[PDB]
Amino acid sequence: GLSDGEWQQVLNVWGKVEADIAGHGQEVLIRLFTGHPETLEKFDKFKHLKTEAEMKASEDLKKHGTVVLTALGGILKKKGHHEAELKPLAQSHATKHKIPIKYLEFISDAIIHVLHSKHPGDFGADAQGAMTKALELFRNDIAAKYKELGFQ
Ligand code: HEM
């Protein structure tokens, strides 16, 4: 649950992402894959990537980064009223991709890391607080659907 002022911070930060969605999406996935190499094994189309240089050179990884952040941005713009947008993603990630909630924690922290890396000194403590709360809400509502499905 976020206040109006917190949502305003989230959507202000998101403007930074929308200026370069592919570059942000690429770096988020690279941070996930290099920090948590077990996550790469869930992607049949990226498991061939052995080095970060190959990851950086992969145009399909940048494409998928655009898909991921476009979906997340659509959810964030609903300011919590995201049941219709979130349900299909919860279902596909639990039942088809088999993504444990832990990996959603990993990618949430990766987003925070990338924002500081690309905007050092321009991602203030209030903005980090609000973005963190928004990603916690996203993860918590996914977790509720995971529990319904019995997925661990
Ligand atoms: C912010 C969190 C995430 C968002 C918004 C997101 C979004 C998406 C979307 C929109 C798709 C394509 C449609 C679909 O299959 O539902 C997708 C596919 C997929 N996601 Fe995610 N995802 C997220 C996190 C993760 C994480 C953490 C993992 C694994 C560590 C993951 C694994 C996958 C896989 C394996 C696919 C299929 C890729 C393919 O072969 O095309 N997702 N995701």
Side-chain angles (χ1 to χ4, degrees), residues 32 39 42-43 45 64 67-68 71-72 89 92-93 97 99 103-104 107 138:
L32 179 71
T39 61
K42 293 289 182 177
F43 291 88
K45 67 177 183 187
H64 197 68
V67 169
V68 173
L72 181 59
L89 291 183
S92 73
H93 286 63
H97 310 317
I99 301 312
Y103 296 181
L104 292 172
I107 205 176
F138 166 78

mmCIF file with all atom_site columns, all heavy atoms in Angstrom, residues 32 39 42-43 45 64 67-68 71-72 89 92-93 97 99 103-104 107 138, ligand 1:
data_model
loop_
_atom_site.group_PDB
_atom_site.id
_atom_site.type_symbol
_atom_site.label_atom_id
_atom_site.label_alt_id
_atom_site.label_comp_id
_atom_site.label_asym_id
_atom_site.label_entity_id
_atom_site.label_seq_id
_atom_site.pdbx_PDB_ins_code
_atom_site.Cartn_x
_atom_site.Cartn_y
_atom_site.Cartn_z
_atom_site.occupancy
_atom_site.B_iso_or_equiv
_atom_site.pdbx_formal_charge
_atom_site.auth_seq_id
_atom_site.auth_comp_id
_atom_site.auth_asym_id
_atom_site.auth_atom_id
_atom_site.pdbx_PDB_model_num
ATOM   1   N  N   . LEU A 1 32  ? 20.947 -9.583  -13.008 1.00 0.00 ? 32  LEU A N   1
ATOM   2   C  CA  . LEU A 1 32  ? 20.336 -10.810 -12.500 1.00 0.00 ? 32  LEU A CA  1
ATOM   3   C  C   . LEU A 1 32  ? 21.173 -12.031 -12.851 1.00 0.00 ? 32  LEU A C   1
ATOM   4   O  O   . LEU A 1 32  ? 21.451 -12.875 -11.990 1.00 0.00 ? 32  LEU A O   1
ATOM   5   C  CB  . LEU A 1 32  ? 18.931 -10.947 -13.087 1.00 0.00 ? 32  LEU A CB  1
ATOM   6   C  CG  . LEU A 1 32  ? 18.141 -12.188 -12.685 1.00 0.00 ? 32  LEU A CG  1
ATOM   7   C  CD1 . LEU A 1 32  ? 17.718 -12.085 -11.229 1.00 0.00 ? 32  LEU A CD1 1
ATOM   8   C  CD2 . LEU A 1 32  ? 16.927 -12.326 -13.592 1.00 0.00 ? 32  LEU A CD2 1
ATOM   9   N  N   . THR A 1 39  ? 19.655 -18.246 -12.279 1.00 0.00 ? 39  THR A N   1
ATOM   10  C  CA  . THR A 1 39  ? 18.509 -17.687 -12.993 1.00 0.00 ? 39  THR A CA  1
ATOM   11  C  C   . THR A 1 39  ? 18.645 -17.865 -14.496 1.00 0.00 ? 39  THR A C   1
ATOM   12  O  O   . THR A 1 39  ? 17.636 -18.014 -15.190 1.00 0.00 ? 39  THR A O   1
ATOM   13  C  CB  . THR A 1 39  ? 18.305 -16.209 -12.636 1.00 0.00 ? 39  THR A CB  1
ATOM   14  O  OG1 . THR A 1 39  ? 19.458 -15.439 -13.012 1.00 0.00 ? 39  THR A OG1 1
ATOM   15  C  CG2 . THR A 1 39  ? 18.047 -16.040 -11.149 1.00 0.00 ? 39  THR A CG2 1
ATOM   16  N  N   . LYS A 1 42  ? 16.913 -20.850 -16.282 1.00 0.00 ? 42  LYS A N   1
ATOM   17  C  CA  . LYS A 1 42  ? 15.484 -20.848 -16.555 1.00 0.00 ? 42  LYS A CA  1
ATOM   18  C  C   . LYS A 1 42  ? 15.161 -20.353 -17.954 1.00 0.00 ? 42  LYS A C   1
ATOM   19  O  O   . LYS A 1 42  ? 14.023 -20.506 -18.402 1.00 0.00 ? 42  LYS A O   1
ATOM   20  C  CB  . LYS A 1 42  ? 14.752 -19.960 -15.542 1.00 0.00 ? 42  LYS A CB  1
ATOM   21  C  CG  . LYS A 1 42  ? 14.775 -20.467 -14.108 1.00 0.00 ? 42  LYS A CG  1
ATOM   22  C  CD  . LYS A 1 42  ? 13.891 -21.700 -13.946 1.00 0.00 ? 42  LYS A CD  1
ATOM   23  C  CE  . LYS A 1 42  ? 13.880 -22.188 -12.496 1.00 0.00 ? 42  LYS A CE  1
ATOM   24  N  NZ  . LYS A 1 42  ? 12.948 -23.346 -12.326 1.00 0.00 ? 42  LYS A NZ  1
ATOM   25  N  N   . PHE A 1 43  ? 16.129 -19.768 -18.651 1.00 0.00 ? 43  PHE A N   1
ATOM   26  C  CA  . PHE A 1 43  ? 15.931 -19.207 -19.984 1.00 0.00 ? 43  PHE A CA  1
ATOM   27  C  C   . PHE A 1 43  ? 16.622 -20.107 -20.998 1.00 0.00 ? 43  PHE A C   1
ATOM   28  O  O   . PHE A 1 43  ? 17.844 -20.040 -21.168 1.00 0.00 ? 43  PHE A O   1
ATOM   29  C  CB  . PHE A 1 43  ? 16.517 -17.800 -20.079 1.00 0.00 ? 43  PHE A CB  1
ATOM   30  C  CG  . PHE A 1 43  ? 15.785 -16.760 -19.282 1.00 0.00 ? 43  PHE A CG  1
ATOM   31  C  CD1 . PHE A 1 43  ? 16.110 -16.523 -17.964 1.00 0.00 ? 43  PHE A CD1 1
ATOM   32  C  CD2 . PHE A 1 43  ? 14.815 -15.971 -19.885 1.00 0.00 ? 43  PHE A CD2 1
ATOM   33  C  CE1 . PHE A 1 43  ? 15.453 -15.540 -17.244 1.00 0.00 ? 43  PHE A CE1 1
ATOM   34  C  CE2 . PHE A 1 43  ? 14.158 -14.997 -19.166 1.00 0.00 ? 43  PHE A CE2 1
ATOM   35  C  CZ  . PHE A 1 43  ? 14.487 -14.778 -17.854 1.00 0.00 ? 43  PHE A CZ  1
ATOM   36  N  N   . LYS A 1 45  ? 16.608 -19.683 -24.067 1.00 0.00 ? 45  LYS A N   1
ATOM   37  C  CA  . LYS A 1 45  ? 17.193 -18.874 -25.126 1.00 0.00 ? 45  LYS A CA  1
ATOM   38  C  C   . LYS A 1 45  ? 18.382 -18.030 -24.674 1.00 0.00 ? 45  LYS A C   1
ATOM   39  O  O   . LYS A 1 45  ? 19.005 -17.360 -25.509 1.00 0.00 ? 45  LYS A O   1
ATOM   40  C  CB  . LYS A 1 45  ? 16.122 -18.025 -25.806 1.00 0.00 ? 45  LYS A CB  1
ATOM   41  C  CG  . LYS A 1 45  ? 15.517 -16.942 -24.945 1.00 0.00 ? 45  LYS A CG  1
ATOM   42  C  CD  . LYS A 1 45  ? 14.532 -16.120 -25.765 1.00 0.00 ? 45  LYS A CD  1
ATOM   43  C  CE  . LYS A 1 45  ? 13.959 -14.979 -24.943 1.00 0.00 ? 45  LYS A CE  1
ATOM   44  N  NZ  . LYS A 1 45  ? 12.870 -14.253 -25.661 1.00 0.00 ? 45  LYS A NZ  1
ATOM   45  N  N   . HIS A 1 64  ? 14.405 -8.863  -24.927 1.00 0.00 ? 64  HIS A N   1
ATOM   46  C  CA  . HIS A 1 64  ? 13.622 -9.391  -23.820 1.00 0.00 ? 64  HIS A CA  1
ATOM   47  C  C   . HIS A 1 64  ? 13.594 -8.424  -22.651 1.00 0.00 ? 64  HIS A C   1
ATOM   48  O  O   . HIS A 1 64  ? 12.592 -8.356  -21.940 1.00 0.00 ? 64  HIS A O   1
ATOM   49  C  CB  . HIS A 1 64  ? 14.130 -10.751 -23.351 1.00 0.00 ? 64  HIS A CB  1
ATOM   50  C  CG  . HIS A 1 64  ? 13.124 -11.472 -22.525 1.00 0.00 ? 64  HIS A CG  1
ATOM   51  N  ND1 . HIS A 1 64  ? 11.952 -11.956 -23.066 1.00 0.00 ? 64  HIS A ND1 1
ATOM   52  C  CD2 . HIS A 1 64  ? 13.069 -11.737 -21.197 1.00 0.00 ? 64  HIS A CD2 1
ATOM   53  C  CE1 . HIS A 1 64  ? 11.224 -12.497 -22.104 1.00 0.00 ? 64  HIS A CE1 1
ATOM   54  N  NE2 . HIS A 1 64  ? 11.878 -12.373 -20.963 1.00 0.00 ? 64  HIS A NE2 1
ATOM   55  N  N   . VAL A 1 67  ? 10.741 -6.191  -23.238 1.00 0.00 ? 67  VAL A N   1
ATOM   56  C  CA  . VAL A 1 67  ? 9.479  -6.858  -22.928 1.00 0.00 ? 67  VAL A CA  1
ATOM   57  C  C   . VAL A 1 67  ? 9.224  -6.845  -21.421 1.00 0.00 ? 67  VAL A C   1
ATOM   58  O  O   . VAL A 1 67  ? 8.127  -6.498  -20.955 1.00 0.00 ? 67  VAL A O   1
ATOM   59  C  CB  . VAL A 1 67  ? 9.500  -8.282  -23.512 1.00 0.00 ? 67  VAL A CB  1
ATOM   60  C  CG1 . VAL A 1 67  ? 8.336  -9.120  -22.991 1.00 0.00 ? 67  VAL A CG1 1
ATOM   61  C  CG2 . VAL A 1 67  ? 9.459  -8.224  -25.041 1.00 0.00 ? 67  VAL A CG2 1
ATOM   62  N  N   . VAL A 1 68  ? 10.244 -7.193  -20.632 1.00 0.00 ? 68  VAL A N   1
ATOM   63  C  CA  . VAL A 1 68  ? 10.083 -7.265  -19.181 1.00 0.00 ? 68  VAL A CA  1
ATOM   64  C  C   . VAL A 1 68  ? 9.726  -5.899  -18.604 1.00 0.00 ? 68  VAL A C   1
ATOM   65  O  O   . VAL A 1 68  ? 8.764  -5.765  -17.835 1.00 0.00 ? 68  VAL A O   1
ATOM   66  C  CB  . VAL A 1 68  ? 11.355 -7.844  -18.536 1.00 0.00 ? 68  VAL A CB  1
ATOM   67  C  CG1 . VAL A 1 68  ? 11.269 -7.755  -17.022 1.00 0.00 ? 68  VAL A CG1 1
ATOM   68  C  CG2 . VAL A 1 68  ? 11.561 -9.278  -18.982 1.00 0.00 ? 68  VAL A CG2 1
ATOM   69  N  N   . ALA A 1 71  ? 6.264  -4.568  -19.469 1.00 0.00 ? 71  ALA A N   1
ATOM   70  C  CA  . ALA A 1 71  ? 5.216  -5.180  -18.667 1.00 0.00 ? 71  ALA A CA  1
ATOM   71  C  C   . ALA A 1 71  ? 5.199  -4.593  -17.262 1.00 0.00 ? 71  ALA A C   1
ATOM   72  O  O   . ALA A 1 71  ? 4.129  -4.265  -16.732 1.00 0.00 ? 71  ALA A O   1
ATOM   73  C  CB  . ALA A 1 71  ? 5.427  -6.689  -18.613 1.00 0.00 ? 71  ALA A CB  1
ATOM   74  N  N   . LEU A 1 72  ? 6.372  -4.436  -16.649 1.00 0.00 ? 72  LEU A N   1
ATOM   75  C  CA  . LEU A 1 72  ? 6.420  -3.888  -15.298 1.00 0.00 ? 72  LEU A CA  1
ATOM   76  C  C   . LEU A 1 72  ? 5.924  -2.452  -15.272 1.00 0.00 ? 72  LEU A C   1
ATOM   77  O  O   . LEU A 1 72  ? 5.184  -2.060  -14.365 1.00 0.00 ? 72  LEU A O   1
ATOM   78  C  CB  . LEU A 1 72  ? 7.850  -3.996  -14.761 1.00 0.00 ? 72  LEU A CB  1
ATOM   79  C  CG  . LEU A 1 72  ? 8.047  -3.475  -13.334 1.00 0.00 ? 72  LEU A CG  1
ATOM   80  C  CD1 . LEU A 1 72  ? 7.172  -4.224  -12.349 1.00 0.00 ? 72  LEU A CD1 1
ATOM   81  C  CD2 . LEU A 1 72  ? 9.502  -3.591  -12.937 1.00 0.00 ? 72  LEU A CD2 1
ATOM   82  N  N   . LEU A 1 89  ? 0.789  -12.828 -15.628 1.00 0.00 ? 89  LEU A N   1
ATOM   83  C  CA  . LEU A 1 89  ? 2.219  -12.960 -15.387 1.00 0.00 ? 89  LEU A CA  1
ATOM   84  C  C   . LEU A 1 89  ? 2.491  -13.910 -14.236 1.00 0.00 ? 89  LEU A C   1
ATOM   85  O  O   . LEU A 1 89  ? 3.392  -14.747 -14.323 1.00 0.00 ? 89  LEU A O   1
ATOM   86  C  CB  . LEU A 1 89  ? 2.845  -11.598 -15.105 1.00 0.00 ? 89  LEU A CB  1
ATOM   87  C  CG  . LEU A 1 89  ? 2.881  -10.655 -16.301 1.00 0.00 ? 89  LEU A CG  1
ATOM   88  C  CD1 . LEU A 1 89  ? 3.579  -9.362  -15.914 1.00 0.00 ? 89  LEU A CD1 1
ATOM   89  C  CD2 . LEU A 1 89  ? 3.583  -11.311 -17.477 1.00 0.00 ? 89  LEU A CD2 1
ATOM   90  N  N   . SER A 1 92  ? 1.832  -17.423 -15.764 1.00 0.00 ? 92  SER A N   1
ATOM   91  C  CA  . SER A 1 92  ? 2.860  -17.924 -16.670 1.00 0.00 ? 92  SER A CA  1
ATOM   92  C  C   . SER A 1 92  ? 4.160  -18.195 -15.936 1.00 0.00 ? 92  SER A C   1
ATOM   93  O  O   . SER A 1 92  ? 4.828  -19.198 -16.204 1.00 0.00 ? 92  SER A O   1
ATOM   94  C  CB  . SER A 1 92  ? 3.067  -16.980 -17.854 1.00 0.00 ? 92  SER A CB  1
ATOM   95  O  OG  . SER A 1 92  ? 3.754  -15.809 -17.450 1.00 0.00 ? 92  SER A OG  1
ATOM   96  N  N   . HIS A 1 93  ? 4.504  -17.351 -14.965 1.00 0.00 ? 93  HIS A N   1
ATOM   97  C  CA  . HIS A 1 93  ? 5.767  -17.551 -14.264 1.00 0.00 ? 93  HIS A CA  1
ATOM   98  C  C   . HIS A 1 93  ? 5.707  -18.717 -13.288 1.00 0.00 ? 93  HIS A C   1
ATOM   99  O  O   . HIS A 1 93  ? 6.711  -19.404 -13.101 1.00 0.00 ? 93  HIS A O   1
ATOM   100 C  CB  . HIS A 1 93  ? 6.266  -16.231 -13.671 1.00 0.00 ? 93  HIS A CB  1
ATOM   101 C  CG  . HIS A 1 93  ? 6.823  -15.306 -14.709 1.00 0.00 ? 93  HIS A CG  1
ATOM   102 N  ND1 . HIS A 1 93  ? 6.060  -14.787 -15.738 1.00 0.00 ? 93  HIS A ND1 1
ATOM   103 C  CD2 . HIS A 1 93  ? 8.082  -14.853 -14.913 1.00 0.00 ? 93  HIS A CD2 1
ATOM   104 C  CE1 . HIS A 1 93  ? 6.824  -14.037 -16.515 1.00 0.00 ? 93  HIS A CE1 1
ATOM   105 N  NE2 . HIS A 1 93  ? 8.055  -14.054 -16.033 1.00 0.00 ? 93  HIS A NE2 1
ATOM   106 N  N   . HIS A 1 97  ? 6.993  -21.131 -16.721 1.00 0.00 ? 97  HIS A N   1
ATOM   107 C  CA  . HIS A 1 97  ? 8.413  -20.857 -16.566 1.00 0.00 ? 97  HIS A CA  1
ATOM   108 C  C   . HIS A 1 97  ? 8.984  -21.427 -15.280 1.00 0.00 ? 97  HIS A C   1
ATOM   109 O  O   . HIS A 1 97  ? 10.192 -21.670 -15.216 1.00 0.00 ? 97  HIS A O   1
ATOM   110 C  CB  . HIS A 1 97  ? 8.677  -19.351 -16.657 1.00 0.00 ? 97  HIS A CB  1
ATOM   111 C  CG  . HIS A 1 97  ? 8.052  -18.703 -17.853 1.00 0.00 ? 97  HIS A CG  1
ATOM   112 N  ND1 . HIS A 1 97  ? 8.086  -19.270 -19.107 1.00 0.00 ? 97  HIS A ND1 1
ATOM   113 C  CD2 . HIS A 1 97  ? 7.356  -17.549 -17.979 1.00 0.00 ? 97  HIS A CD2 1
ATOM   114 C  CE1 . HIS A 1 97  ? 7.453  -18.483 -19.959 1.00 0.00 ? 97  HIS A CE1 1
ATOM   115 N  NE2 . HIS A 1 97  ? 6.995  -17.434 -19.297 1.00 0.00 ? 97  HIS A NE2 1
ATOM   116 N  N   . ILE A 1 99  ? 9.234  -20.142 -12.015 1.00 0.00 ? 99  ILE A N   1
ATOM   117 C  CA  . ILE A 1 99  ? 10.136 -19.139 -11.452 1.00 0.00 ? 99  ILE A CA  1
ATOM   118 C  C   . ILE A 1 99  ? 9.817  -19.011 -9.973  1.00 0.00 ? 99  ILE A C   1
ATOM   119 O  O   . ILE A 1 99  ? 8.739  -18.501 -9.627  1.00 0.00 ? 99  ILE A O   1
ATOM   120 C  CB  . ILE A 1 99  ? 9.978  -17.778 -12.151 1.00 0.00 ? 99  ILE A CB  1
ATOM   121 C  CG1 . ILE A 1 99  ? 10.265 -17.889 -13.645 1.00 0.00 ? 99  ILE A CG1 1
ATOM   122 C  CG2 . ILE A 1 99  ? 10.896 -16.753 -11.488 1.00 0.00 ? 99  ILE A CG2 1
ATOM   123 C  CD1 . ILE A 1 99  ? 11.537 -18.644 -13.953 1.00 0.00 ? 99  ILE A CD1 1
ATOM   124 N  N   . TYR A 1 103 ? 13.424 -15.593 -7.021  1.00 0.00 ? 103 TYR A N   1
ATOM   125 C  CA  . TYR A 1 103 ? 14.043 -14.947 -8.177  1.00 0.00 ? 103 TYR A CA  1
ATOM   126 C  C   . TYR A 1 103 ? 13.397 -13.603 -8.470  1.00 0.00 ? 103 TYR A C   1
ATOM   127 O  O   . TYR A 1 103 ? 14.038 -12.721 -9.061  1.00 0.00 ? 103 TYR A O   1
ATOM   128 C  CB  . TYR A 1 103 ? 13.992 -15.829 -9.426  1.00 0.00 ? 103 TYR A CB  1
ATOM   129 C  CG  . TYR A 1 103 ? 14.772 -17.133 -9.339  1.00 0.00 ? 103 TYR A CG  1
ATOM   130 C  CD1 . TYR A 1 103 ? 14.811 -18.002 -10.415 1.00 0.00 ? 103 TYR A CD1 1
ATOM   131 C  CD2 . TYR A 1 103 ? 15.487 -17.472 -8.192  1.00 0.00 ? 103 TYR A CD2 1
ATOM   132 C  CE1 . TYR A 1 103 ? 15.512 -19.196 -10.351 1.00 0.00 ? 103 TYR A CE1 1
ATOM   133 C  CE2 . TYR A 1 103 ? 16.186 -18.670 -8.118  1.00 0.00 ? 103 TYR A CE2 1
ATOM   134 C  CZ  . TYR A 1 103 ? 16.193 -19.514 -9.206  1.00 0.00 ? 103 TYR A CZ  1
ATOM   135 O  OH  . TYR A 1 103 ? 16.885 -20.699 -9.148  1.00 0.00 ? 103 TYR A OH  1
ATOM   136 N  N   . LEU A 1 104 ? 12.129 -13.436 -8.082  1.00 0.00 ? 104 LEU A N   1
ATOM   137 C  CA  . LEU A 1 104 ? 11.478 -12.134 -8.186  1.00 0.00 ? 104 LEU A CA  1
ATOM   138 C  C   . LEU A 1 104 ? 12.037 -11.151 -7.172  1.00 0.00 ? 104 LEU A C   1
ATOM   139 O  O   . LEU A 1 104 ? 12.109 -9.947  -7.453  1.00 0.00 ? 104 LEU A O   1
ATOM   140 C  CB  . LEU A 1 104 ? 9.962  -12.293 -8.045  1.00 0.00 ? 104 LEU A CB  1
ATOM   141 C  CG  . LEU A 1 104 ? 9.340  -13.033 -9.237  1.00 0.00 ? 104 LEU A CG  1
ATOM   142 C  CD1 . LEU A 1 104 ? 7.875  -13.350 -8.979  1.00 0.00 ? 104 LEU A CD1 1
ATOM   143 C  CD2 . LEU A 1 104 ? 9.485  -12.252 -10.523 1.00 0.00 ? 104 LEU A CD2 1
ATOM   144 N  N   . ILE A 1 107 ? 15.360 -10.046 -8.861  1.00 0.00 ? 107 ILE A N   1
ATOM   145 C  CA  . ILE A 1 107 ? 15.235 -9.039  -9.915  1.00 0.00 ? 107 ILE A CA  1
ATOM   146 C  C   . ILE A 1 107 ? 14.787 -7.692  -9.354  1.00 0.00 ? 107 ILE A C   1
ATOM   147 O  O   . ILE A 1 107 ? 15.146 -6.634  -9.893  1.00 0.00 ? 107 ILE A O   1
ATOM   148 C  CB  . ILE A 1 107 ? 14.348 -9.544  -11.074 1.00 0.00 ? 107 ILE A CB  1
ATOM   149 C  CG1 . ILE A 1 107 ? 14.710 -8.804  -12.366 1.00 0.00 ? 107 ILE A CG1 1
ATOM   150 C  CG2 . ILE A 1 107 ? 12.875 -9.370  -10.740 1.00 0.00 ? 107 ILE A CG2 1
ATOM   151 C  CD1 . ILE A 1 107 ? 13.961 -9.286  -13.590 1.00 0.00 ? 107 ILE A CD1 1
ATOM   152 N  N   . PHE A 1 138 ? 4.239  -5.573  -5.795  1.00 0.00 ? 138 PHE A N   1
ATOM   153 C  CA  . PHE A 1 138 ? 4.204  -6.434  -6.972  1.00 0.00 ? 138 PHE A CA  1
ATOM   154 C  C   . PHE A 1 138 ? 4.534  -7.872  -6.596  1.00 0.00 ? 138 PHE A C   1
ATOM   155 O  O   . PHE A 1 138 ? 3.802  -8.808  -6.946  1.00 0.00 ? 138 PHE A O   1
ATOM   156 C  CB  . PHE A 1 138 ? 5.227  -5.869  -7.961  1.00 0.00 ? 138 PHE A CB  1
ATOM   157 C  CG  . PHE A 1 138 ? 5.592  -6.768  -9.107  1.00 0.00 ? 138 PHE A CG  1
ATOM   158 C  CD1 . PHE A 1 138 ? 4.742  -6.907  -10.190 1.00 0.00 ? 138 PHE A CD1 1
ATOM   159 C  CD2 . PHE A 1 138 ? 6.821  -7.402  -9.143  1.00 0.00 ? 138 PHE A CD2 1
ATOM   160 C  CE1 . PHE A 1 138 ? 5.099  -7.705  -11.280 1.00 0.00 ? 138 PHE A CE1 1
ATOM   161 C  CE2 . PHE A 1 138 ? 7.172  -8.203  -10.215 1.00 0.00 ? 138 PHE A CE2 1
ATOM   162 C  CZ  . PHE A 1 138 ? 6.310  -8.349  -11.285 1.00 0.00 ? 138 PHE A CZ  1
HETATM 163 C  C1  . HEM B 2 .   ? 9.778  -7.756  -12.940 1.00 0.00 ? 1   HEM B C1  1
HETATM 164 C  C2  . HEM B 2 .   ? 9.608  -9.081  -13.007 1.00 0.00 ? 1   HEM B C2  1
HETATM 165 C  C3  . HEM B 2 .   ? 9.245  -9.806  -14.313 1.00 0.00 ? 1   HEM B C3  1
HETATM 166 C  C4  . HEM B 2 .   ? 8.438  -9.405  -15.293 1.00 0.00 ? 1   HEM B C4  1
HETATM 167 C  C5  . HEM B 2 .   ? 7.604  -8.107  -15.371 1.00 0.00 ? 1   HEM B C5  1
HETATM 168 C  C6  . HEM B 2 .   ? 8.449  -10.423 -16.312 1.00 0.00 ? 1   HEM B C6  1
HETATM 169 C  C7  . HEM B 2 .   ? 7.760  -10.365 -17.490 1.00 0.00 ? 1   HEM B C7  1
HETATM 170 C  C8  . HEM B 2 .   ? 7.778  -11.317 -18.480 1.00 0.00 ? 1   HEM B C8  1
HETATM 171 C  C9  . HEM B 2 .   ? 7.004  -11.279 -19.700 1.00 0.00 ? 1   HEM B C9  1
HETATM 172 C  C10 . HEM B 2 .   ? 6.056  -10.124 -20.099 1.00 0.00 ? 1   HEM B C10 1
HETATM 173 C  C11 . HEM B 2 .   ? 7.281  -12.386 -20.388 1.00 0.00 ? 1   HEM B C11 1
HETATM 174 C  C12 . HEM B 2 .   ? 6.690  -12.819 -21.741 1.00 0.00 ? 1   HEM B C12 1
HETATM 175 C  C13 . HEM B 2 .   ? 5.229  -13.287 -21.540 1.00 0.00 ? 1   HEM B C13 1
HETATM 176 C  C14 . HEM B 2 .   ? 5.052  -14.435 -20.563 1.00 0.00 ? 1   HEM B C14 1
HETATM 177 O  O1  . HEM B 2 .   ? 5.637  -15.517 -20.816 1.00 0.00 ? 1   HEM B O1  1
HETATM 178 O  O2  . HEM B 2 .   ? 4.302  -14.265 -19.556 1.00 0.00 ? 1   HEM B O2  1
HETATM 179 C  C15 . HEM B 2 .   ? 8.240  -13.173 -19.626 1.00 0.00 ? 1   HEM B C15 1
HETATM 180 C  C16 . HEM B 2 .   ? 8.779  -14.386 -19.990 1.00 0.00 ? 1   HEM B C16 1
HETATM 181 C  C17 . HEM B 2 .   ? 9.669  -15.114 -19.249 1.00 0.00 ? 1   HEM B C17 1
HETATM 182 N  N1  . HEM B 2 .   ? 10.093 -14.810 -17.971 1.00 0.00 ? 1   HEM B N1  1
HETATM 183 FE FE1 . HEM B 2 .   ? 9.710  -13.121 -16.951 1.00 0.00 ? 1   HEM B FE1 1
HETATM 184 N  N2  . HEM B 2 .   ? 9.285  -11.453 -15.917 1.00 0.00 ? 1   HEM B N2  1
HETATM 185 C  C18 . HEM B 2 .   ? 9.801  -11.084 -14.693 1.00 0.00 ? 1   HEM B C18 1
HETATM 186 C  C19 . HEM B 2 .   ? 10.683 -11.813 -13.926 1.00 0.00 ? 1   HEM B C19 1
HETATM 187 C  C20 . HEM B 2 .   ? 11.230 -13.013 -14.308 1.00 0.00 ? 1   HEM B C20 1
HETATM 188 C  C21 . HEM B 2 .   ? 12.301 -13.725 -13.628 1.00 0.00 ? 1   HEM B C21 1
HETATM 189 C  C22 . HEM B 2 .   ? 12.990 -13.253 -12.330 1.00 0.00 ? 1   HEM B C22 1
HETATM 190 C  C23 . HEM B 2 .   ? 12.557 -14.839 -14.322 1.00 0.00 ? 1   HEM B C23 1
HETATM 191 C  C24 . HEM B 2 .   ? 13.604 -15.951 -14.087 1.00 0.00 ? 1   HEM B C24 1
HETATM 192 C  C25 . HEM B 2 .   ? 14.661 -15.853 -13.279 1.00 0.00 ? 1   HEM B C25 1
HETATM 193 C  C26 . HEM B 2 .   ? 11.692 -14.864 -15.468 1.00 0.00 ? 1   HEM B C26 1
HETATM 194 C  C27 . HEM B 2 .   ? 11.646 -15.865 -16.408 1.00 0.00 ? 1   HEM B C27 1
HETATM 195 C  C28 . HEM B 2 .   ? 10.979 -15.793 -17.600 1.00 0.00 ? 1   HEM B C28 1
HETATM 196 C  C29 . HEM B 2 .   ? 11.105 -16.728 -18.692 1.00 0.00 ? 1   HEM B C29 1
HETATM 197 C  C30 . HEM B 2 .   ? 12.008 -17.975 -18.678 1.00 0.00 ? 1   HEM B C30 1
HETATM 198 C  C31 . HEM B 2 .   ? 10.324 -16.318 -19.683 1.00 0.00 ? 1   HEM B C31 1
HETATM 199 C  C32 . HEM B 2 .   ? 10.148 -16.977 -21.067 1.00 0.00 ? 1   HEM B C32 1
HETATM 200 C  C33 . HEM B 2 .   ? 11.257 -16.430 -21.969 1.00 0.00 ? 1   HEM B C33 1
HETATM 201 C  C34 . HEM B 2 .   ? 11.216 -16.953 -23.385 1.00 0.00 ? 1   HEM B C34 1
HETATM 202 O  O3  . HEM B 2 .   ? 11.708 -18.079 -23.633 1.00 0.00 ? 1   HEM B O3  1
HETATM 203 O  O4  . HEM B 2 .   ? 10.717 -16.233 -24.284 1.00 0.00 ? 1   HEM B O4  1
HETATM 204 N  N3  . HEM B 2 .   ? 10.883 -13.741 -15.427 1.00 0.00 ? 1   HEM B N3  1
HETATM 205 N  N4  . HEM B 2 .   ? 8.521  -12.487 -18.460 1.00 0.00 ? 1   HEM B N4  1
#
